[PDB]
Amino acid sequence: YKAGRDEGCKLVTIGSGYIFATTGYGIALQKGSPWKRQIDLALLQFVGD
Amino acid sequence: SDKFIYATVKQSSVDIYFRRQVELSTMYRHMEKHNYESAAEAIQAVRD
């Protein structure tokens, strides 16, 4: 995001988009939360639409 | 179009994704016309 919004493109990521950790962003929830299944279904529906 | 024949693996995740996309359903009409059993057959077809 910073490289995209950077002016002049003086900064760049190595490898033309190299990723090592290859993990993601998730919505943390309490253990055994009743909202987990519904929230997972909502995210999957959003990404599928 | 008749000449531009594009396809994917029949009965897979991408088929579900395209069927769900109501806006892109006009392509799905073509998509059902030509489909392949597996990815190997499709890549052999695109190679040939």
Chain B nearest CA to A36, separation (Å): 23
Q: How far apart are alpha carbons A35 and A43 in whole angstroms?
A: 12
Closest residue by Cα to residue B19 from B3, B35, B43: B35
Q: Tokens standing for A27? A: 């919505």
Q: Tokens standing for A25? A: 């962003």
Q: Tokens standing for A20? A: 């090592």
How many C-beta atoms surround the C-beta of residue B31 within 10 A?
Answer: 19
Q: Is B12 within any annotated ligand binding site?
A: no
Q: What type of residue sits at position B34?
A: H
Q: What type of residue sits at position A36?
A: K
Q: How far apart are alpha carbons B42 and B26 in whole angstroms?
A: 22
Technique behind this structure?
Answer: cryo-EM
Q: Which residues of A touch B20 (CB under 8 A)?
A: 48-49
Q: What type of residue sits at position B7?
A: A
Which residues are CB-neighbours of A16 under 8 A, at least 6 positions away? none
